[PDB]
Amino acid sequence: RDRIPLRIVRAESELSPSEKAYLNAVEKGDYASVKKSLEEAEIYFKININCIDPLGRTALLIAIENENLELIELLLSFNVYVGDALLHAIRKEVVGAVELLLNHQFSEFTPDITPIILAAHTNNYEIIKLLVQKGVSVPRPHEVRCNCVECVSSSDVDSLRHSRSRLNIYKALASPSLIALSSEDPFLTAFQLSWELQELSKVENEFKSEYEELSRQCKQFAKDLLDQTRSSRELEIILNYRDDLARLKLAIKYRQKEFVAQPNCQQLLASRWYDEFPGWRRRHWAVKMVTCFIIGLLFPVFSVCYLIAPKSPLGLFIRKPFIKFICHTASYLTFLFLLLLASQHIDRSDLNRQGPPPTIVEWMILPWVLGFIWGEIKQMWDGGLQDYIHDWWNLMDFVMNSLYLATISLKIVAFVKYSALNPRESWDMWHPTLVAEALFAIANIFSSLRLISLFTANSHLGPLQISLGRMLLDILKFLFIYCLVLLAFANGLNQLYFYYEETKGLTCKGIRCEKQNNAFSTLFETLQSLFWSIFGLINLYVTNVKAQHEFTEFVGATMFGTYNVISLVVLLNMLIAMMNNSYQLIADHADIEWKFARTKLWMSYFEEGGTLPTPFNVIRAADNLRRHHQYQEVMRNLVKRYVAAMIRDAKTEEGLTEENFKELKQDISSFRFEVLGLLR
Amino acid sequence: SSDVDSLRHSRSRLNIYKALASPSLIALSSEDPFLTAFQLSWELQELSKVENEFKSEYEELSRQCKQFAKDLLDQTRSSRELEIILNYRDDLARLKLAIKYRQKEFVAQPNCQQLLASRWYDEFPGWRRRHWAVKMVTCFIIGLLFPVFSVCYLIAPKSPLGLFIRKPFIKFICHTASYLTFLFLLLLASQHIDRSDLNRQGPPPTIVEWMILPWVLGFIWGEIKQMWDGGLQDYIHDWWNLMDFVMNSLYLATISLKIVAFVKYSALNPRESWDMWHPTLVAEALFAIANIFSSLRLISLFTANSHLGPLQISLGRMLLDILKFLFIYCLVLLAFANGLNQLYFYYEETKGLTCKGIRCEKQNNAFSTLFETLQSLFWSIFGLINLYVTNVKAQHEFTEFVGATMFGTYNVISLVVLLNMLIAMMNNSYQLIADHADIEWKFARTKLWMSYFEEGGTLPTPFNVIRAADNLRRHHQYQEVMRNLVKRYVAAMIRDAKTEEGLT
Amino acid sequence: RDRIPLRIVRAESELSPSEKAYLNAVEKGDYASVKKSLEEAEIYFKININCIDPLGRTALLIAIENENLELIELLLSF
Amino acid sequence: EENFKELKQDISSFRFEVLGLLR
Ligand SMILES: CCCCCCCCCCCCCCCC(=O)OC[C@H](COP(=O)(O)O)OC(=O)CCCCCCCCCCCCCCC
Ligand SMILES: CCCCCCCCCCCCCCCC(=O)OC[C@H](COP(=O)(O)O)OC(=O)CCCCCCCCCCCCCCC
Ligand SMILES: CC(C)CCC[C@@H](C)[C@H]1CC[C@H]2[C@@H]3CC=C4C[C@@H](OC(=O)CCC(=O)O)CC[C@]4(C)[C@H]3CC[C@]12C
Ligand SMILES: CC(C)CCC[C@@H](C)[C@H]1CC[C@H]2[C@@H]3CC=C4C[C@@H](OC(=O)CCC(=O)O)CC[C@]4(C)[C@H]3CC[C@]12C
Ligand SMILES: [Ca+2]
Ligand SMILES: [Ca+2]
Ligand SMILES: [Zn+2]
């Protein structure tokens, strides 16, 4: 044998020539031929009414695909096995599914698929409304964090079916047409559904993209729903609705970035940000800088008026959120400026004083440290503990405050434990004064690096700062890989060099001086020398041995050279490849991320909790019924126009497929035969 | 036939394979479309390698065959059907067959991965729903008890304590915990926990090294069994297997040299006056190199993690691009090393110095010899070679200028040109690898997962050294299931996609 | 309870079976049926001429969407 | 989809009157 004898292996049962003509008449829309053949079948029992084409299409399915309502009615007049024809009509999005609804095995749909679930998948408003008008219900899925005995038992029996059924239910519930129809509050339903779908993607490692797409679709629906507001009164009603912008705060907690960054939503927020401050967005940039500078210089007098004279014209200026931000920023700059003055030695503090009294500059630095702690305490008071620890900057603030407390405690300890004359060069090296200065210096770095969080307010540094933060997570991933490589070579280099590098009597012991002696004596020294070789600060004589062991020296330098190639040529250049690719993904929708972050910064100054800056902070049924009606009224309009604008128009702008061409031939072919039948 | 008409023969062969690779023909006339698609994709991939021309056409045909198998498996709607298909053989025999055929899309199917995760976490419910802090705590305490779990497995088979280790997830944790203890012991060896002196020419093994030895024997013992239960072709396919062989070879040389030094040198001699080729010196050198390889083996464990997994796979797939520039850079490096050594080998014959080379404060002879020239040129990438290395004791400023210009030209080519060109590749390379990176990681994670499914390596490294009726029934139940899959695949993919085709 | 009882919350006012047929005739371009139904509306006051489909399309809007100038002229006659 | 929906209308408008004219 030299040829492949192709043969039918599975295929399907063949069709009689009469049956093939009968199905061909259904495809061609020949009503007279189909009616005659069906009448002959019920009187001669020759052909099978429920014959199946090679592609798996029966007579009813062919008529449904061509949307020949007359043919469907003719077939339904006889005893045609409907089977899953209703699902096929729903999937094909044929509005003439009413005939199958009120009409007194191998399936292309899973057994868990119901007409309502499939209708919601198709996102057809007319079909969904038709089914909901009748008796229709959807099985309710269990929570993401569920421990039901039935849930685990069902998954154990069939894991594939359980996952598919759960995905199908959530796909049906996430359809905007179903939410706009059967949901009491579609804005709240979309917020909760996106949260649940996002949690499912994290829990279900498989089908992560499907769940993420469903959550993104829910987030998009809420943004499109809010896009239908045409008056500022409607926007205020929706955003302030609660069961203060309570609904806007709810959207923030659900990470509805698209909803928050809506142009109308941002415009209203900017009005609250610049309340009673007209023309700020139209002034020159030089005027803006001058006005902000003079306002910031007068932050203490504004806080003094707020404390002394409430509800006063001078005390009402600070209540503006924009003025709060400027005054708070000006307070932080003064604190940072005082930190620079502390290192500048404005007042004499001597050098040999073991326990020094606090400097005059440090004396008025202390209220800011107490104010920062006082403000952080109130952050956990008015706000929830879950939200307090969510922010990354909150952890950074806690570290800075902890370092400041240790500095104050060590300064107090040194004051009350050391009161004798002793030159600095002959101290303990673990002196409380030395540790206090070290922790103060570290806290100064964190205090000055806190100004990055203020970049969100600016329109130019805002999107950049957010992008760098979102890209820092990629650096953390290479910290694991580099450290594993760093520890691998540090282990090898220390193992080789710890015999010879036992030299004593030198001025130094390590790498941090002119004569770098013991680069790989210990594991700690090996790690430092390997770390500093990235920047080229480790010379080549660190691999030398006093003994004339050139083979050991060559191996050590080759191991040092291999690390340099891997870390610098390979790892560093690989790191660049990620962040360049990472930014291309982050560059798009970077405005949405910044606007969401800027909104959170803006609403942090809306309330009265932190009106005072850091240094000076230490010194029903009828109304509820009315709001529900006015929210439902407004929401009725939004859903109605959303359906007309998005659901209807997008379907009209949909592209043309082969089914439409196949359809157009059927109407011509149906008009083809009866005109010939009528004329002849 | 090819000699008579090469163009016709190539076109005829491509047309035949294009016809055979059509999913409609496979779903119709093939006895086992899953096996036919696996074999056809393998054959088409081999043809692309052999036929340099029409490589894209053959690669597209193989990709189409791989896509058909993934779409065919996408039609399973019950877990019983998936188990029947994946366990079918002529253990997941069909899944293993797909792995050997590099059916990454077939392996990384969400339903296929879900069943594999169930086997990975068998009798361990709620692991995927627990908090990350709980996961870390549970893994840590389980890993700390790896010796007691292995002891129970050896002492008490089919016992409640001895059945916990049989879980593949527990095997991975216990094996990982075993490797970390071995790596921790390697750090202790360099930390000099016990006194080993310094002038002992032939030293007895340290107490720390005494219990290090079982791991080395266990690693060799486990590697031997890897070639026993598994095929030799599959044993050498894995890159990490070659890395393990190098690490084991270095450890054997260290043990052999330590034994040789013990039985050949037993006299007092300070270390600074040794041979420089002493067996103790070579043993320490090879032990240090093996320590680097042993600790770098932890990269292969990154595949299990969902975050470090795709990253690690991408870097490995990108390392091949670095190897391509190793040829180009070395050619440039050897070109300038030849020129610099030719110019500087007359003058740089100085003697009587403390040093001879570049690895000290006074870098004397950077280009005396070809070996020294290569080292000095290599170290100039990181800026560790100073500018006085191009100076001559003689007042030959023209020769010095030419040598520094040749040194300067190499620096521009290697750093400004070659290094920046290398960045351009990997940035473009990642953009290609960034897509379908999840499929590559999931395929690699699957191979790691099934490596713990069988009983071949249940014990960790330190403790490893201490019919017709049934066949007929399986064929019918596989064909039954396969009949349903093909029937619904034709209706869902072949029919519906044609209806959604564009209008011409 | 373990199932979600989907119900109509806002939707829109329902259509009479005669009104549904009247709008269906406008969509299908049946000039004779539309003219007869419109004539019956002005003599029997049974169906609403300005009935609205679930999607928010009235009889005039449906004819405009299909660009049936004859249907628009017929509707504008009444 | 509007163009396809349109093309059906002209056929459907020509559908009924020809039937009305013949019958
Ligand atoms: C996830 C990542 C994991 C790690 C992946 C690593 C992939 C492999 C990376 C390469 C490692 C092998 C090469 C190491 C060579 C070495 O250390 O070599 C170091 C030795 C050091 O010599 P001494 O010991 O005498 O100082 O150099 C020599 O012996 C002289 C010959 C040098 C030839 C070097 C050839 C390769 C250089 C590659 C540099 C590329 C620069 C590109 C821009 C100009
Ligand atoms: C596949 C790749 C193959 C190789 C391809 C090579 C392409 C050509 C690459 C450039 C080579 C020619 C330039 C070499 C100049 C040189 O060696 O110059 C080296 C000499 C060294 O002088 P000494 O000998 O006195 O030290 O410099 C001088 O004589 C003084 C004038 C310097 C002018 C340099 C102008 C070009 C510099 C390019 C640097 C670009 C830096 C960009 C970022 C800032
Ligand atoms: C050593 C001390 C004195 C600090 C020196 C630097 C500061 C003067 C700089 C550093 C970061 C700057 C900030 C970076 C970003 C912004 C946001 C941006 O805000 C606005 O445009 C106003 C609010 C808004 O409309 O959103 C411009 C001011 C501000 C606070 C900047 C004010 C000046 C700051 C604090
Ligand atoms: C000096 C010694 C003590 C080593 C120090 C570093 C180790 C403690 C680190 C380095 C790499 C880490 C591994 C990197 C990746 C993974 C995969 C990942 O696996 C899982 O999440 C569980 C399995 C799965 O579900 O796939 C997390 C654990 C593990 C083994 C990590 C365990 C801890 C390791 C071995
Ligand atoms: Ca804070
Ligand atoms: Ca191996
Ligand atoms: Zn439950």
Swiss-Prot record, chain A:
One of its GO terms (biological process) is gamma-aminobutyric acid secretion. The chain crosses the membrane at residues 322-342, 363-377, 392-412, 435-457, 471-493, 559-579. Disulfide bonds join C508-C513. Strongly expressed in placenta. Expressed at lower levels in heart, pancreas, kidney and brain. Expressed in endothelial cells. Isoform alpha was found to be the predominant isoform. Isoform beta was not found in pancreas and brain. ANK repeats lie at residues 15-46, 57-79, 82-104, 111-135. Changing E108K: In a breast cancer sample; somatic mutation. Residues 284-318 dip into the membrane without crossing it. Residues 193-230 form a coiled coil. Ca(2+) binds at E376, Q379, N394, D397. It is found in: Cell membrane. Residues 1-283, 319-321, 378-391, 458-470 are cytoplasmic. Residues 343-362, 413-434, 494-558 are extracellular. Keywords: ANK repeat, Calcium, Calcium channel, Calcium transport, Cell membrane, Coiled coil, Disulfide bond, Ion channel, Ion transport, Membrane, Phosphoprotein, Repeat, Transmembrane, Transmembrane helix, Transport. May be operated by a phosphatidylinositol second messenger system activated by receptor tyrosine kinases or G-protein coupled receptors. May be activated by intracellular calcium store depletion. Inhibited by xanthine-based inhibitor Pico145. GO terms for molecular function: beta-catenin binding; cadherin binding; calcium channel activity; inositol 1,4,5 trisphosphate binding; store-operated calcium channel activity. Zn(2+) binds at H142, C146, C148, C151. Belongs to the transient receptor (TC 1.A.4) family. STrpC subfamily. TRPC4 sub-subfamily. The interaction with spectrin is important in controlling the translocation of TRPC4 channels to the plasma membrane following EGF stimulation. The cell membrane presentation, the calcium entry function and the interaction with junctional proteins (CTNNB1 and CDH5) are controlled by endothelial cell-cell contacts. The protein 4.1-binding domain (654-685) is required for binding to EPB41L2 and channel activation. The calmodulin- and inositol 1,4,5-trisphosphate receptor-binding (CIRB) domain (695-724) is sufficient for the interaction with SESTD1. This is Short transient receptor potential channel 4. It comes from Homo sapiens (Human). The chain holds residues 15 to 755 of 977 of the full protein.
